Design a protein around this ligand. Structure first.
Ligand code: GSH
Length: 215
C-alpha cells in the first residue's frame, strides 16, 4: 500500500494513525501543495489523503482508508465507544484552531511547501478562505488563551493516556491529529492528561510531534 499526503494535513494524519497503531508498512509520499495533476489522475479530484491499494486502485477519504486498513487482518483495533462530549469539544475547537495553525504551517519546513510555488499556493488559498495571516497572527495570544482554556475542559475527558475514552476508538483518530498539529503553536498551556495522551498516542502511532518546530 502507498499513501499520498501532506505532512500538516489532519486527514492525512488520521490515515497514518491506523498504519502506526497496527504496525502495517506503507509507502508515504508527500505531494507538493500546488500539485493538482497527481491527485486528480488518481481519484478525479485534488485532495489528500489518497491510498493506493495493493491491486493499484486509488481510494480517497481519510475515514474510508482508516476503516479499510483496520479490517484487513480481521482484527479491528477501533472497537471502543466514541463520546458525545468529545464530539462537542472537537466541534468547538475545529471552529477556530485553523486561525492558529494555518499561518504557522505556511512558515514552516513541511515537505509539501518545499517549492516557493507550493508554499505560495497554500498561503493564497488559505488567506482567501481563513483570512489575512498577519491579522490571524496578531490575534495569537487571544487564540492561545482560547485553546489553553478549551484544553483544560478536554483534560477532564481523557480517560487513559493510551485511549481518550479508555479503549481505542474513532475519537482517537479524530482528536490526536489536532493535538499533534497544535504542538506547532508556541505558548499553549498543556494540561497533564492531555499532554500524556498526546505523547502516548504519538508513540503508538509513530507520528512525530512538532514541538521542536513550534512558533
Ligand atoms: N473528506 C476528506 C478531507 C480531506 C481534505 O480536506 N484534505 C485537504 C488537506 S488537509 C486538501 O486535500 N484540500 C485540498 C487541497 O489541498 O487542494 C478526507 O477525510 O480525507
Amino acid at each position: 500500500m502507498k499513501l499520498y499526503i501532506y505532512d500538516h494535513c489532519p486527514y492525512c494524519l488520521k490515515a497514518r494513525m491506523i498504519f502506526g497503531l497496527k504496525n502495517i508498512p506503507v509507502e508515504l509520499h508527500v505531494l507538493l501543495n500546488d500539485d493538482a495533476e497527481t491527485p486528480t489522475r488518481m481519484v478525479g479530484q485534488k485532495q489528500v489523503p489518497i491510498l493506493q491499494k495493493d491491486d493499484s486502485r486509488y481510494m480517497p477519504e481519510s475515514m474510508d482508508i482508516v476503516h479499510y486498513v483496520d479490517k484487513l487482518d480481521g482484527k479491528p483495533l477501533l472497537t471502543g465507544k466514541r463520546s458525545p462530549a468529545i464530539e462537542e469539544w472537537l466541534r468547538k475547537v475545529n471552529g477556530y484552531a485553523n486561525k492558529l495553525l494555518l499561518p504557522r504551517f505556511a512558515k514552516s519546513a513541511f515537505d509539501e511547501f518545499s517549492t516557493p510555488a507550493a508554499r505560495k499556493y497554500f498561503v493564497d488559498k488559505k488567506e482567501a478562505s481563513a483570512g489575512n495571516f498577519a491579522d490571524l497572527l496578531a490575534h495569537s495570544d487571544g487564540l492561545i488563551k482560547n485553546i489553553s482554556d478549551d484544553l483544560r475542559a478536554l483534560d477532564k475527558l481523557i480517560v487513559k493516556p493510551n485511549a481518550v475514552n479508555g479503549e481505542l476508538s474513532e475519537d482517537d483518530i479524530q482528536l490526536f491529529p489536532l493535538l499533534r498539529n497544535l504542538t506547532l503553536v508556541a505558548g499553549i498551556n498543556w494540561p497533564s492528561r492531555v499532554a500524556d495522551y498526546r505523547d502516548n498516542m504519538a508513540k503508538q502511532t509513530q507520528i512525530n510531534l512538532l514541538s521542536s518546530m513550534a512558533i
